[PDB]
Design a protein around this ligand. Sequence first.
Ligand SMILES: *P(=O)(O)OCC(C)(C)[C@@H](O)C(=O)NCCC(=O)NCCSC(=O)[C@H]1CSC(c2ccccc2O)=N1
Ligand SMILES: [N][C]([C][S])C(=O)O=P([O])([O])O[C][C]1O[C](N2[C]=NC3=C2N=[C]N=C3[N])[C]([O])[C]1[O]
Ligand SMILES: [Mg+2]
Lengths: 153, 153, 1320
Amino acid sequence: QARRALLNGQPACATARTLHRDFFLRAAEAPDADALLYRDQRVTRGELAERALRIAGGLREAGVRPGDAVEVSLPRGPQQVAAVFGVLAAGACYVPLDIDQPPARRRLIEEAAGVCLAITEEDDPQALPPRLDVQRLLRGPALAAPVPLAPQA
Amino acid sequence: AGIWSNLQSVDTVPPHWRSIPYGRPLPGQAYRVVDTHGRDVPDLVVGELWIGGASLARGYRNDPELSARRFVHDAQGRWYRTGDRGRYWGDGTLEFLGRVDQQVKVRGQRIELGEVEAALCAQAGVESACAAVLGGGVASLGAVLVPRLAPRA
Amino acid sequence: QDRDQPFELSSVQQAYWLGRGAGEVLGNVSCHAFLEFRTRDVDPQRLAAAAECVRQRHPMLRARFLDGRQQILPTPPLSCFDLQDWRTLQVDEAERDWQALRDWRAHECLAVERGQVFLLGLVRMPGGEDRLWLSLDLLAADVESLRLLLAELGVAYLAPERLAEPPALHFADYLAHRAAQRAEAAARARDYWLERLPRLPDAPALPLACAPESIRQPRTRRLAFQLSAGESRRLERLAAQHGVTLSSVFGCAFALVLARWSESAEFLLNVPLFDRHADDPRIGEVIADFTTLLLLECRMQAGVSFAEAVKSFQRNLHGAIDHAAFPALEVLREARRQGQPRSAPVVFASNLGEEGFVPAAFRDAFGDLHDMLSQTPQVWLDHQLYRVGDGILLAWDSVVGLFPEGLPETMFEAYVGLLQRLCDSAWGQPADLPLPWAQQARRALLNGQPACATARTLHRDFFLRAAEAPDADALLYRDQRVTRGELAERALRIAGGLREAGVRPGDAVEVSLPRGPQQVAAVFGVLAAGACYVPLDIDQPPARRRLIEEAAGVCLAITEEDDPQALPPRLDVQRLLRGPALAAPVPLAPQASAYVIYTSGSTGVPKGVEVSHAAAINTIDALLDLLRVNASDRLLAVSALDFDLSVFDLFGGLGAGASLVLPAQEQARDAAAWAEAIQRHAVSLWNSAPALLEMALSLPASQADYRSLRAVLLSGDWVALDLPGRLRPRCAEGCRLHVLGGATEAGIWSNLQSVDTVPPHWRSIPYGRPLPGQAYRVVDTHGRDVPDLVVGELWIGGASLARGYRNDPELSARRFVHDAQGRWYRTGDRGRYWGDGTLEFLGRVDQQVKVRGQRIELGEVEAALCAQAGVESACAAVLGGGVASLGAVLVPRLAPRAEGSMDLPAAQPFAGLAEAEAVLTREILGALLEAPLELDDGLRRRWLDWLADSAASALPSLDEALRRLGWQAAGLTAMGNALRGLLAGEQAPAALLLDPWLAPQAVAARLPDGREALARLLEALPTPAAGERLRVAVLDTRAGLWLDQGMASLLRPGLELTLFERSRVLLDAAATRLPERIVVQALDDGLLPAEHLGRYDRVISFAALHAYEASREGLALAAALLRPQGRLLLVDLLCESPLALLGAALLDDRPLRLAELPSLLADLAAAGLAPRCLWRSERIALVEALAPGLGLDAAALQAGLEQRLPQAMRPERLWCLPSLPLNGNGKVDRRRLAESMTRALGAEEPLEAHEQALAECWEAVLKRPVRRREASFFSLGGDSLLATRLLAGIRERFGVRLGMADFYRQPTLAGLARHLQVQT
Ligand SMILES: *P(=O)(O)OCC(C)(C)[C@@H](O)C(=O)NCCC(=O)NCCSC(=O)[C@H]1CSC(c2ccccc2O)=N1
Ligand SMILES: [N][C]([C][S])C(=O)O=P([O])([O])O[C][C]1O[C](N2[C]=NC3=C2N=[C]N=C3[N])[C]([O])[C]1[O]
Ligand SMILES: [Mg+2]
């Protein structure tokens, strides 16, 4: 029990904060740095933070709000990463699914998650959750900052 | 438990490892290993890995009853009750020993065989199903069906 | 009710109003809500018009608060709208100005005395942001009424034409209705609450960094957490499933946090509920204060499901709404009127109105609530809730600096953690919170510390150290030293002697030997026999010894005597040393019992703590490996053998081959003997209770040089904060003090706070980290761990626990307990972790008592007495008697000052006097020997020898003896007759000490020119020359007959006299015979009442300073009793009266107590008294000596205790001592102090003009007749409401500006007169 209380007792080694906080800091600190590299093109932290904050503004415009949840269902690539940061920066909890996740199973998850919205390249405001094009959320106005989430959201 | 809960560094494998163990718990989070009655098992004894401390998920998104079955509370705080089996070796390392239950790994991903079986019972015409990950180098997921017969006199 | 005339405050408005009081407990603040809101732009003139429009709509926004009543203005004098247009400024200067404006108007006491209960305002930031904000004093309004003010502002900003109707129901008509309408319900609930006041729980016993009385400027710090839509939905649907109002969910979860953070899970929390019930539906639009305050006595159960806990909280909450018909404030008043300081300074304001807190008409006009602040007075933790968005803003308006830093943060993080644990998981789960993981993670490291020990039999290493180096020093004694080989072969001789006597592995053996090498050889011999040693003091009384022999089930006793026929077979250690040697120690597996150490058998059946070798050697290694103990070290065994510290001295010290300097049994508490032992044998290690090292350090650095002392261990009792500071220059360079924690039930110790010096945040030296291999918990009464900073019971765990109480398994299951965390000794120490993982110990659990209306922190009373000028040390206890009084005790430090230079007037005595007393000694020896059977045979033979030895064979004289003595042959006859009659009654000591012819100091007050000694002692009492009042006292009064013999020299005009003795029956005679101008008071059970400190300009001692257990004892008693510049007047026996020596032989008390003139004057100058010797040569030597500024006086103590303690822990009686008495096991004897005070315990009109003119003020305000001064205002019938009318009454009656906090510390009539006496 002594050994195990040491190994369990290992101190927090963390600063409790909103999960996105640090990326938006790394972006504000070096907007030009390569955040993403993808299919032989690249995205800066500034570009990604803006793309995310535009998605966030599009999500607050689409009725998403702090600790409410948002499905993200995008092919693997920068728009996916921008969307999860944009969900988190809208204050929301992202509910990732593969775009390959099949429709009846996706409906079990969309039903069980109580999900406010889904981000999917498809626009369909009449889906089980309202379903949204990330490319349209990328036309959204940028939020000037991520929404202040307390660390436990 | 959050993205991980242990770290075995591996500069080399000492030959007595039957598997690469779960190492020390990651900082700020913890492991118990318990008897089926919730008390800690002694070192080298196999029991159920309870992950604990600050890294844990808050629960399942809209399943409070399964949350209470997993995210349990004890005189030692809050614990995820994983259903992984394992043992603390005498040096306080945590050998993970696979799972006792219907949950298995396919091409790295987590699958509940109860999910595969239920997705087969969701077939009109299946009375019940079994699923298992199989032997051979393919490591394939297999399943087995009982059809429902639509009786008459 | 006339709509602009003064009308009564609602009860809960009085709670805010009286909380504005600069002298009220955590008062001086508004009870305002500050709200803050954001938008890019708003028209400031629309706002200015809107704010003034809502004032002229609602009476209560324009209500003035004065004289504890409210009165409504047609419009207020002071500005409605604090516009601050900064659209031009630099952004960050505007932000700093906003933060100043924010901190100001969010902490602001609004001018409610000028009707400014409502104030709107607006910074216009140059960043393009109009931050509308709103300071509403809740004297106007409920929070549920504040959202209606927002509704009115939202409309009045956007479309003021739609403000269709100003709500016609005036708040005075609502009160004039409500206060009459409630009447039966209020009485019905008053009867409920009155009968519950003794049974009400406390405020939540949370960790406070500051006393609430010790801050005048309570800034609220808000903590907040927005539960989302989804978390709100999950709580709302789960609240529905479990059948509870959503306020009950949040209130239950809050009360579970406060329970987990309280010392006890039962407390009051003030629930402001929303009594917006009225006949007019427009009450739903009136802005006045519809708060009603519910004193929810929550009692939160542990380990139940949250589903049970929340239904319980709801049932309590709902049922208590009916009892809130008599308002919580009047319950808190009636508690004060019943002598209980109860409060609900923690608050649960569930403003959960389903629309969103900020109403939609306002959410259109400005963004939903950005931030907010309370300033609720007299409330530590104002928890509120708001629907925000469609989510729920949790808010905790904690107070800045009141809680520890990071505590409202962590406690609130646990509350949010709980509420998400309620969202995402079913309420069938335990209502017990987790410890917030960071706290538990640290404590898992502290408890996780590896064994750092090898499991082995406790004696093992000593027998190795002997086989390695047999000629090395093991023990150093009175003169001689025993080597390891000698000690090992002596131990193994005793071991074989014990095997032969039938003792065998783990069977228990008493070791009652005087401290010395044979005692050590006996414990190592018992342990080498494989047996378990049961050490006892040889001076322990026989009845207690039989209980311990019985209770240990003791196989055998080693006792320096053979009696194989006793309760156990009892053996002489010298015969056991004549026994055969064992070849080797009998093999024990380490888990076997090593010793059983016994507490005092005054506790009923003696608790004997059986410790295994594994446990003992674990603690020992865990300390040897920290002390780096080595073969050159030399410990001092000041620890008695029945005090478990000796186990480290023995099996630790000699396990490392470090030799023991042993005090002998006559040196068992002697600091001078220890000091020489350190200075002589170059002692490198020390180990004791702090009261022993305090006693060692009480000797000067020149008299007692400890600079050999490489490291110091202190244990078992509170270590004073100055003590490391006193110790650093005394011990070796690199002082290495360690203070060590925990009871014998955890082996010798369980903690180590290393001390270089005290960091200034300590209030006692804490328990440190647990020692290696063992562990601590602090637990709630339910056995769950309490959080950091939270006081609970200390539990000790792991590889050092005692096996149990030796033959009480039933108590062992109560005091040792078992969890998923392993096995724990449940100590009954209070204490708390700190954030850094240090473990503050806070006294035994009985060192708190729920005395008659409050929990007393007796450790805090001791800490506050130690802060007095000139105090060495203090104790506090709670007593017997019909009051069950608080009691406390002091000691002065005496300012040692080397004034002792002298000459002795030797010219008056001659040898024919000592011959006269030798003759009279022979005659009265011979006179008792006319009936020689009144003695025992030992005294008979002594007396028959002294009939020649104390007589003409040494100091012969003729009948001239009689004329030297002053008593003639009539007196010789009267002595012989009295002595035979008294001893045919056998009435020594008691009647011998009552007798004029025979009492030892009284015969010394005649025979040795004793009346002439007494005369020249009493002479120069200056009052019949000076014509001025003089206070005299006597230390050694006994029967008063020796004083009566001097009394013609004592009855001086202006002389006041007080008479003292450490005995009751003798003072009854003194009090019988001496006139009513002379006072008599016992030092009952050794204890001086504090009313006498610093009071006496003169103090008398007669032929009895040796009758104290030190010179330093009776001297320190004298010095404390003396007024500064006052004179001790002493005759000391540099030789006894030969008849007082018969007297002492009939007490059978040793003549070795007596001391020389330099020996007296050295200790007396160390007691600070500056001396002259004066008289009677080498016999009955007169000394007088002058007192320094010791500062102790009951007046000065009252002023210091008024400066440092609340009225609920006044030292209800107060006493003093020359030093605190000591346990056999080293501690300050808090039981003897408690019993002694319990023995020493044993209305009238106003008579000052200020008391009488105050009685007129109390009688005017309270109506009831103020005939008695001794009453306290609240106990008589006062309230904080009535304290305003009393202050204003004093401001009419006398004109003085009353400090209301000082009046709350001074609630009795003369205590109130204090501020009038000083014309404040
Ligand atoms: P006195 O006549 O009061 O008699 C003596 C006693 C001992 C009773 C006196 O010293 C005392 O304790 N007075 C009562 C103090 C008290 O109870 N204070 C708290 C009243 S509570 C209240 O309803 C607050 C808390 S929640 C709410 C609020 C919400 C939003 C924004 C601000 C505030 O304050 N109001
Ligand atoms: N010696 C001892 C043990 S160490 C004994 O014996 O006694 P007791 O009672 O049991 O114990 C003591 C008491 O107190 C406490 N402590 C310890 N340590 C200390 C203390 N206090 C204070 N400080 C310190 N350090 C214990 O636990 C008990 O209660
Ligand atoms: Mg004890």
